[PDB]
Structure formats: C-alpha cells, structure tokens
C-alpha cells in the first residue's frame, strides 16, 4: 500500500507534457506488478488458494 502510494506520487510528477513517452511503459510495468501482488495476497487470504 505504501509502495503504491509512492508510485502514484512519482506518476503525478509527470507532465509528461514535455516528457518522453517510454517511461509510460515502465510506469505501467510497475503498476501491473503492484496490482498483481496485492491481488495475490488477497486471494491467498480468502485465500491461500
């Protein structure tokens, strides 16, 4: 949760009105990672299955 609140903090410190596109791919990469692992931890509890 804290870690995503940080990804979200750096994400806003785009314009990228300037700002070179590709970081778009890496930010997405980090976001997918976060969603997947939180979703896993929830699953595991409801659920270790």
């Amino acid at each position: 949760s804290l870690l995503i609140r940080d990804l979200n903090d750096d994400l806003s410190k785009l314009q990228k009105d300037k700002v070179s596109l590709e970081d778009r791919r890496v930010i997405f990469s980090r976001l997918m990672n976060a969603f997947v692992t939180i979703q896993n931890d929830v699953n595991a509890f409801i659920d270790s299955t």
Binding site: L3, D6, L7, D10, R30, N33, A34, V36, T37
Partner: protein, 303 residues
C-alpha cells in the same frame, strides 16, 4: 608521554581555569566596551560555537572581507591596564604557584609543565601507566597484552568507557575468543540508547543528537559482515527498529539491502523497493553514486 585515560587530578587546574577565564572576561569585556566561579568559566567558554569517501569540510566562500589593525602598543595596554588589577584581588586568594601561572599566561608565556607532568596521586598515576600501556600495546599490534591491559583497566572503579574503540579494534584484530566486536558494539547501543562539559568531544557522545563514530562503524562494518555472505534483513531489521530520523545513510543502507537481496516477481518487488528508498534517501544530505549507475545495475537485473 601519551594521553592518559583518567579524569585529571583536580584543585590547582580548576582554580587556574578560574583565574584564566575570569581575566579573559575582563579583557574581552573592556574590549567590547572600547568597540562601542565555575559558572563564570561556564558562560565564558559557553558563548562560542561549541575519488574517495571524504566527509568534506566547509570551504572558503561567503566570508567577510577584512580588518585593519586594531591594536597598537598604547591602545592594547589601555585595554589591559585595568583588568589586571581586578585580577590583583583574587590572585591574593589563590596559591603562589597559581599566581605565577596567572602572571605568565597573562604575559603570554606558555607553561613548561603539562597537567600530567605535575599530577600526583598513587592510584591515578598507576591508572595513567595502565591506560598508557593499553594505547601503546594497541599501537604495537600486541592484541594479547593490550587485551590484558583493557580487562585490568575496565576492572578499576574509576574508568567509564571511552575505551570502547580500543576494544572494537581490539577484539576485531584479536579473533581469539570472546563475544566479538559486533557483540560489544550492539551491546554499547543497547545499553546506551536510553535514559535508563569537560570530557566530551564527538568520538564519544550522548544520544540526544548524533552519537556518531561507534554507531555508523558497527553499521557499515556489519554490512561488511554481509560482504562475508555474498543477516541482511537482521541488520536492516534493527536499522528499521530505531527512530533517529536524521540519517538517510540508513536509507542507502536499506536500499543497499534491497540491491543485495535483488542480487521472480518477489525479486521484482525488491527492485521496486530499492528504487523507492533511493529517492526517500534523496530525502536528506545526499549519498550519491551517479545513481543512473545504481539504476544500470537495476537494468542488468531487469534482464
């Protein structure tokens, strides 16, 4: 001929400190006029600021231009003439040797004999020789003897522990037996991190604001006890434990624990982790690699 690890034998040195800082007060007082007690010594000493990894200093820029001569013979002896008699009053109360010392330091001559060189009491002179032989043996790589010196010394009821770096490097180079340098250091921090002047520069300190040397050295040296490895989540577990927020260096320790643990999506989370703590380590007085180098290791990881 070496520093002694004992509180200095007392009376005359303290009353001399009196005479000195009292006369100092009278001269500097009249000096500010012309530019317009343990406690007297206390205020007196008081109002005054109290390619490799060089903890650099503060160099020369933003400092004010000049002064041109303040002090001719006549003008100085103007400032000096009166505070010397005020001194004539309590000089009459101090001892003749002390009075002579006041006369000579006030002429500007510097005394021949050290505080040690004129010191005098059996037990303290013996402790002086003990501590001396400690420092000498530690210099001589004689870690065995030096260890005997240290144990016999700490036995004595007068010695609080400055001597800890002696035992840190001592047990360090000893390797012999006893619960070792790390154990001693973490002991130092566990006993002296809780409420549970003369002697004190920075290399031994109090835990209001930075206790420096020993703490940072067990920190780094423990991360090198992980250089033994490739323990980490331990070291950053008790670097996680303390609140003493003005560090950042433990933020780079933290992010270094995550780069060392990053050496599958778990490894991903460790790499995002170090990516986070490097910026929350841009929080404070920066420890910087070009850090695109840090990231370049992290892309060698992203492989």
């Amino acid at each position: 001929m070496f520093e002694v690890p004992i509180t200095l034998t007392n009376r005359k040195f303290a009353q001399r400190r009196k005479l000195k800082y009292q006369y100092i007060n009278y001269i500097s007082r009249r000096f500010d006029r012309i530019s317009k007690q343990q406690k007297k010594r206390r205020r007196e000493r008081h109002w005054r600021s109290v390619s490799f990894e060089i903890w650099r200093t503060v160099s020369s820029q933003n400092k004010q231009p000049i002064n041109k001569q303040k002090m001719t013979y006549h003008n100085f002896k103007k400032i000096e003439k009166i505070p010397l008699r005020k001194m004539e009053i309590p000089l009459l109360h101090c001892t003749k040797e002390n009075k002579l010392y006041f006369q000579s330091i006030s002429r500007g001559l510097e005394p021949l004999k050290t505080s040690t060189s004129e010191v005098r009491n059996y037990r303290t002179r013996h402790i002086v020789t003990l501590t001396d032989l400690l420092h000498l043996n530690v210099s001589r790589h004689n870690w065995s003897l030096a260890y005997k010196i240290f144990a016999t010394l700490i036995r004595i009821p007068g010695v609080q522990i400055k001597s800890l770096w002696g035992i840190g490097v001592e047990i360090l180079d000893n390797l012999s037996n006893s619960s070792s340098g790390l154990d001693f250091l973490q002991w130092m921090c566990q006993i002296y991190s809780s409420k549970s002047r003369s002697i004190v520069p920075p290399f031994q300190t109090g835990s209001r604001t930075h206790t420096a040397k020993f703490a940072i050295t067990y920190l780094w040296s423990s991360l090198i006890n992980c250089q033994k490895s490739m323990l980490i989540d331990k070291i950053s577990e008790w670097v996680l434990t303390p609140p003493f927020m003005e560090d950042a260096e433990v933020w780079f320790i933290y992010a270094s624990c995550h780069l060392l643990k990053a050496d599958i999506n778990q490894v991903i989370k460790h790499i995002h982790y170090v990516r986070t703590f490097l910026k929350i380590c841009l929080d404070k007085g920066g420890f910087a690699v070009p850090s695109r180098l840090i990231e370049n290791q992290l892309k060698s990881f992203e492989s």
